[PDB]
C-alpha cells in the first residue's frame, strides 16, 4: 500500500509544519473546484478528507484563510494545508454521510426523516451559522450536500467555504453565488447589497425540503422558482420587493395547506419565520436555535433512536452567543 509523505501545515494556531504520512488514498468526489480523496493517517488510522484545488499565483486562497480562523463542532475540522504539483490542499476531518444522502433515502422509500433528526440536523446547522455570522462571514451555499452527517453520533458538520466571503456594508457583492433551490429572492432580484440573511433563507429551504420529501422552490429558472416563491408566501408588496432591492399576482397560500397533514405546527411556523421576503424580518440563526420546534432537544430525557445520547448541543462561547448573548438563558437548559 502507498504511502504519501508531505510537510504539512496544522490548520489553527502557530505555522509550524510536520511530517504527515498517509494511505490508502481515493477519490470520493469531483465537481467545480477539483477533487476530493479520502486517506488514512499512517499514525493514528484516522481517516481523513483531502480537498484538492488548483492556486491562484497572485492571490492568497480566501477559503483556506477562512478555515484556519474556524473552530466550531458543527464545522468540519482543517487538520492541515499544503501544496502540491501548483495545488492547494486541505487535509479535513472525514465525514461518512451527508443530508442530501439521508433525505434521498428516505424520498426513494416514500418516507420522511423522523423529526428528531429533522430538529437535531436543523439546530446544528442554525448553530454553525450563528456562529460564521459572528465573523461576519456568509458561507453562500448552503445546500443539503454541504451538510454532512455522521449517522451514528447524529453529528451534522457544515463544509465548503468555497463560496464564503465576509460581508462589509456598504461593499458590493456578486449576486450568482448560492445553488438553484436554495437562493434567497434577494439573490434571484439581482441585488450585490445583499447580507448574511441569505444564509436564513437557505436554511429555511433545508428545513422545508426534510419536511416535504421534496424541495419547495424548484425552477430551471429564476422566473420559475420566483413563482414558486410567490405561490407560498403570496405576492410580494412594493416596500417588501424595495427591501430585496432590485409582476404575478397571487395570495398566500397558509403555510399549514403547505406540508402534509401531521407536520409539527412549531415546524411550520418556524419555516414561515426564515422564509420571508425581507431579509431583516428573518430569524437570525441564534433565534433559530431557541425557537419551541427544538425544544424537544433541550429535554434532559432526549435520546438518539439508537440509544445513544445526543451530540454537544450547549456548548457555547461568548462568541457564539454575542449576536444577543440574553438567549443562553433558553439555549443553555437547567441540566446542560
Ligand atoms: N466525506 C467528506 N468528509 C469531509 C469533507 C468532505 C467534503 C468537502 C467538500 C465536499 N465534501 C463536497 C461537498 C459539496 F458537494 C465538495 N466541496 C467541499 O468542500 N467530504
Redesign the pocket.
Known sequence: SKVTTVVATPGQGPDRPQEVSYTDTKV??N?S?GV?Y?AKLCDSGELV?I?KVLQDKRFKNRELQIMRKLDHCNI?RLRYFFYSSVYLN?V?????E?VYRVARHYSRAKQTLPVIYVKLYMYQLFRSLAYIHSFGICHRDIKP??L?LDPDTAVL?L????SAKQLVRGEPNVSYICSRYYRAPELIFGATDYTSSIDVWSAGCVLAELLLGQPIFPGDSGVDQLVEIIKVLGTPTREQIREMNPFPQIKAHPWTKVFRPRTPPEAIALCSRLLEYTPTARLTPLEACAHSFFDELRDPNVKLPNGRDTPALFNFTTQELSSNPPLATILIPPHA
Open positions: 470520493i468526489g465537481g473546484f476530493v479520502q478528507a480537498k468540519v486541505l479535513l476531518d472525514y465525514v461518512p451527508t450536500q454541504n454532512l458538520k463544509c465548503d467555504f468555497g
